[PDB]
Subunit: 498 residues, 4 copies
């Protein structure tokens, strides 16, 4: 390269001389303080780690493309979803509870975080492999996630703490049922479905509004593992899912999902018999059928896992024109929480990293800070200005809002006609599951209750009978026999647990 090159450089671009021996006073002497190559390489190594995501620490992903193949222009003006549009994507899959090195095949919810690099900005649909969640208000979220993680003294996960939380927060029943059924253990990420979970607002060119749910249906089908199979794989290959996805794309096999929405007319959101703003509820497909939008294909692996996946920063706040949030309190908390976490996790200029930059021109009133890579030159730092540096100043009602009225309060959402904590769970167990799925469910739930502190077990029996009397008695019988599956990722009991 240069006349004095040595095969590598220091950080300033000068030849490094050696990547293999330190600078010493003679062969036998001490290292000197001015071994700058030693200092720079150690100091960098010491700063390679960044805080893991909380939650969803363990994951990986791939790039691809979304292709619109239907006409949903009547429901939305969003450029990404206009007829024929092809958009570059990035999808990160994850578990929830486990940390950075934790086995992929623990029983858990999976994340399904999808970015669309649109002509009007980055559009993030940060979903999960379930249409619902455990909770309906974000004040409970911190407590739920901590219940799912480790005991403060011993540092062990503990099914007693999990069940103490779940039983004391019966809104959790719908999603815990789903978690304990077949789908708590996907065989691969390619073989699970993806959902937005929340209701979102779609707005058309004329300003008319619909409430929407998103459903990504795998073209590879839904395939799951048993508890015993997942536990075996956890030991043999802690990165089974990560490996599977990367190898599949490497071999040219491009996993696909079809996107469908449900669309509720604006005024019907207030009157529907289940609350669409309640994240523990599904919306009947009889009442609001799925409408096809198009197809997602993953076709390109990362070249750098840390820069393109670990550093990726997805947010529900990354909406685009034609798509808004909704009165779902959980979604409203998420609009604050992700960007906040990322400022700490990654840094103040997280959105200037390549994977997080939009394709379109950014013109944003934010300046300075640590690691300001793409500065604004002499552009105006204030508005209005007499300098030819533009700004935004639309007044009046926004196109992606709604109405509200009341006193400031902290209380449960009002029940719709058919809202409760246990009904939809009960449908799932009685009507959706097969006989064999029911059998397996009883083995799972009894297994998850083994060794749990008796007072909490008794509350869990009442909880499962409220879902369904027959399943609940079956679970209780099996737990009183000291039977049931080992659950990958967690256990109860013993002198280091509750």
């Amino acid at each position: 390269t240069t006349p004095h090159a040595t095969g590598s450089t220091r950080q300033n671009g000068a030849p490094a001389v050696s990547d293999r021996q330190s600078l010493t006073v003679g062969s036998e002497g001490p290292i000197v303080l001015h071994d700058t190559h030693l200092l720079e390489t150690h100091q960098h190594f010491n700063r390679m780690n960044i805080p893991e995501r909380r939650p969803h620490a363990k994951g990986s992903g791939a790039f691809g493309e979304f292709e619109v193949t239907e006409d949903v222009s009547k429901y939305t003006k969003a450029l990404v979803f206009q007829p024929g549009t092809k958009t570059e994507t990035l999808l990160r899959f994850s578990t929830v509870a486990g940390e950075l090195g934790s086995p992929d095949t623990w029983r858990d919810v999976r994340g399904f975080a999808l970015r669309f690099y649109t002509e009007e900005g980055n559009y993030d649909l940060v979903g999960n492999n379930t249409p619902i969640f455990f909770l309906r208000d974000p004040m409970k979220f911190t407590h739920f996630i901590r219940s799912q993680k480790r005991l403060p003294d011993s540092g062990l996960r503990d099914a007693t703490m999990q069940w103490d939380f779940w039983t004391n927060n019966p809104e959790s029943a719908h999603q815990v049922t789903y978690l304990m059924g077949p789908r708590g253990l996907p065989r691969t990420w390619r073989e699970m479905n993806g959902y937005g979970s929340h209701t979102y607002l779609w707005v058309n060119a004329q300003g008319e509004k619909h409430w929407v749910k998103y459903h990504f249906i795998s073209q590879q089908g839904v395939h799951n593992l048993s508890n015993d199979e997942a536990t075996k794989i956890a030991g043999e290959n802690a990165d089974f899912h990560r490996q599977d996805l990367f190898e599949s794309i490497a071999k040219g096999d491009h996993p696909k999902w079809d996107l469908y929405i449900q669309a509720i007319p604006y005024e019907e959101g207030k009157t529907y018999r289940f609350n669409p703003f309640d994240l523990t509820k599904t919306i009947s497909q009889k009442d609001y059928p799925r409408i096809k939008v198009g197809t997602l294909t993953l076709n390109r692996n990362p070249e750098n896992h840390f820069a393109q996946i670990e550093s990726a920063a997805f947010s529900p706040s990354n909406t685009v024109p034609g798509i808004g949030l909704s009165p779902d309190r959980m979604l409203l908390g998420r609009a604050f929480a992700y960007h906040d976490a990322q400022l700490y996790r990654v840094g103040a200029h997280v959105n200037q990293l390549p994977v997080n930059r939009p394709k379109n021109a950014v013109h944003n009133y934010a300046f300075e800070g640590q690691m300001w890579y793409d500065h604004t030159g002499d552009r105006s730092t204030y508005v209005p200005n007499s300098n030819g540096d533009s700004w935004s100043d639309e007044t009046g009602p926004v196109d992606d809002g709604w109405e509200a009225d009341g006193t400031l309060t902290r209380e449960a959402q009002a029940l719709r006609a058919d809202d409760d904590d246990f009904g939809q769970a009960g449908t799932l167990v009685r009507e959706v599951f097969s006989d064999q799925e029911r059998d397996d469910f009883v083995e799972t739930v009894a297994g998850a209750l083994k060794g749990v502190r008796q007072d909490v077990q008794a509350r869990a029996f009442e909880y499962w009978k409220n879902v369904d009397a027959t399943i609940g008695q079956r679970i209780e019988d099996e737990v009183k026999r000291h039977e049931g599956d080992g659950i990958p990722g967690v256990e109860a009991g013993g002198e280091a647990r509750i």
Copy 2:
């Protein structure tokens, strides 16, 4: 508590009102920006994680006591090792390569980081479950650890990268042999030995010097698992070792280790036939026998894992009077590197956290910074001063140094009479291992080479024949038969690996 109490507070000590519902405009309305309890709890949750240790992310520990029961005052003036002395301790055990959530029973070196809370400061003996290491100069360390972690694109561990490094750095043979033998898989932390590895300097009251090795011999014996057993446990219980230690102490069973040293007279350090400043070498016990010092007992579990173990910050630089470092280049790099990592990992006042504070009075010229909990009031910020605020000013040769002479260089340490890369490895395989250990070793090493890229396998066969011709041919035969154990924690081959 207070007249207006509600059961919990915000950060300012005021009643929090609700830990369970957010502040909304009516039951059905949006959350308001001024839900300060929601913001404070989310913002804290978002900042709970700190970067994991690199390396040694996965670990746990316990408090105890060291009791001196012999007289080694002739070799050292250190208060902690004077006859009869009892000192409070903290011991953190760990693996090396795996991240925060990784299974405890992966094949790996274990850490054995021991702090003594002495009357003359915190004395840290930051050791491992092996007397040696893979390398003899710290410029190689960053490269070794990265070889032990994940592929940059796919994020998978890869035995090809591990073996490419090891074969290209034959100084690694002694420790890789130890790693691939019985002791790469302890059954429990209670059932492994601990070692300082490095030579350290001991200095007596009269100033006379000895070079010392530390050996902690478990009173519970050395007990190991097979590859197959460890892989099974990795799936069933990723925190097997953590759990075992906590439960054992909880039950009143106090694990013990006896400390012995070897003591080389100062002048003999320069002449000994193996280089004691070379971390890939053991010192013959025939030449320098073990001398008993005393007994370590662990007897108290943490009450808070994160504050007392995760935040603990051990450093080889934490010497005390009577104990010094040595010309071992690896130890000299460690004296810089740990404190540096901790400033980033934990913060600038890491040593003001309770677990890291000394028992004795600190009088240190450092001030301000983020999170300055224990400030110095109006004390002098400079020296000398006319203010009655003391400082240190000893001139001349230090009591814990040595001599050096030469030109500034980057080169291998000079060989002693019997120094090489393969000899001591060869002794271990031929003379220390039993027949059955040899058999198992061949299954381990062949297993670890399965699927490794052929060019690297061929180099590995030469490497193992250099250790011992018979073991090397046995390994090569078994690898060419496509046989050998699955190794917990790693594999090779396939479209997502080298």
Copy 3:
């Protein structure tokens, strides 16, 4: 101290040996990497600085006591304001625009940040030396502060940018008038008044509500400097105010302020002819007279400026029972913004530093993070729990809220009968100022406009005529004569400005 002591320690508590010479290979040789005392002291020094506050970087303060001497129990249940109560306080004074080293006597608003260490938590009244502000919605705040700071290319403050902002945001007129009058330059912090500015909610024991303004009237009177005097002092003594306060307390001279409130009945807040939720408005004392509460006395200097003042973290969100926020949008933004800034500026455990800790027992659902000094042991990390670890769960309307109704919008607050941008400014200039104050005001404002870009000057003449036709013509005449005072802290014109 210890047998081997040397006069100071390293961070681990061991003797440091020397604070005055580095560890070298002979007298003439290089410093060795393992000079750990050198590394620790440099690495700490390198991390002493933390980001300065934005805004209000330049300031200082003192501790004292608040004594209630009247009965305002009818308006509030807050313990701190109940008859007879004596409460420890801390008060930090500041400028706004200038950075850490900037002269105290620049023309500017002053901060008046008062903490009360109450029995029901820390109560922060974070005010200023003015009853109003420049703006009525916090989206404008970032832009205003940047207009008040430096040009992006040259790094100079610039009166053109200041006036471009002010003229394009005519809501600023009331406060700019106050800024350009006598009170923009206090002689000392002891000789200025303090105000809450915002309307706050007070709530009595029976739940009845009043809207309140706070007024701290100096017992030392209101004394100001001329522009020329302040500029002279800026050169001679950049820390004039800091010095004055510390010396005055050191000499035993305890500066005092009397607290008065105005109290508007709840329902009258909606109907009053000026909007009390509009921070650019004062409330007539004829309509709502001042009601005495008690007396503030400062009587104790800090022993450590950095730990007790620089690290202090005040927030309007630090309310206590009996005191709430209000529909003032500016206050509502501040409830989020201060705690957020402090997490970055100081750290995640900012509220565990001594100066920021409450006197009463904290029971808060937040755990872990960097620098966790006061950990929660084995306490429950979730709610509800079966572990005896309490939490809060009040449901329904809060005691310190109010009502709202409408669609989501971005628009100006609705005008009350007498709301406008220029009226109250006009009263101040015409009716409150003396003849001599008017004269000085014209010299100040003309001075501040000297060298400002002509197009912006013309807008400023219209702006000042809208305040008052006579003052505006006088200013314009003087600016067209190229006359007026030099303003401490800023200028316009030239090749490095707009």
Copy 4:
């Protein structure tokens, strides 16, 4: 721009809608939590500040070009200094003690930090406007800088602390003399000289070594201000120097400096009668005359002060082939300290910001970390490797080293024949200063001693008599008369100082 554009974007590139009003529930209602544009802009604003440099917080600079016009190839192989070479530069000027907002015209040393963007990396000559410094060992540096900053309780600078340090560290006399003479107050940065201060190693193509000093002589001459003039300007224009430089370049007036070196033959470094490795010493130009190299011209202002100047990160460790460090202990400490400070101040990827990137290809073994903008793709993370990813492995003595021999010690450098603390100071006062400069010096030093605590004043009189008996008696006489200049930036005495 886009169909739905509004004049600005959020961080994701989507239209922001309004930079001027917040999202509220009706005109009169509260702001909602999901005003993401409000949150993003406030959260960014709150993170714009980064820690100021310690020391040298206050400064500015400009870009330019260096042109070699002589032949010094016989002394160095460095590409930047080969005949005819033209190289892009960046120069930052600064004071030392004052913080970010402090007046430019305080009495102080000035920094002269020059980067050359060479074909073999960034070459940083981080100098000052003086050929010497206050100290000769870096363990004293932290203490000196803190002595120059603020009292721990009151936060005031204090000449008593300054003089207590200086008198107790008489090595300081040479540089304090220079500081208190004419050159402590440059009129402009354009009108001062620049120096490397330290001895550096130059190495030619054949490996032959010389010790070198760098001297940048202003073509605008050396022009200074009186104390009274500088104090006046401090009040009137705190950014006088910053403004001057920017306006001068804006007007097309390109300030220039001629570079000269002194060159000492390698073996003569050990024998010279003054120690060239002692930073408190100058080298006689009679013994080693100046040799011209070329000319520095500044010709381009920054477009963004924060990105190009505030974030610039200069280090003496940024040497290039042909230029090395030296046995000067102060320089050896600086090789560690700057890069360390920058990791905290700016971040782990400070050297990836544009202003800090080299022009040539970087091939450096460092990966991951926060804000990794320019990732290494799938390149090898270790060495040696079988992957075609190069590394460095030169063995033996380095081309830019030297010899050493001795025991590890902490002691003063050995004196050369003519080394002492006061001699060179004495020459400066007696022989270099004019009569009128001597007069002014007496007024400066007496002024700086006014109000200083008597015990420290008495030590200062002995100190100045040791420099020169006549100057010392003159200073003492004037101080006992209570006379002398006000010093811009500092004073003594009173109840808030020592």
